[PDB]
Copies of this chain bind each other. A is one copy, B any other.
Amino acid sequence: CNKQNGVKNILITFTDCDTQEVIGPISHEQPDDTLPTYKNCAWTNTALTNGYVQRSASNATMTLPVVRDLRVPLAFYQGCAQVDVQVEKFDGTVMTLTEGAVVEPEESDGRSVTMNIVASEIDELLPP
Interface residues of chain A, those whose CB is within 8 Å of chain B, are 3-6, 29-30, 32-33, 43, 46, 48, 51-57, 90
Contacts and interface: CB of A to CB of B under 8 A. Distances in A.
A51 B56 CA distance: 39
Nearest to A89: B55
A5 B90 contact: no
The A interface, classified by DSSP as helix, strand, loop or mixed, is: loop
B54 A3 contact: no
A32 B91 CA distance: 37
Contacts of A30: 56-57
A104 B63 CA distance: 32
A4 to B, nearest CB: 5
A66 to B, nearest CB: 12
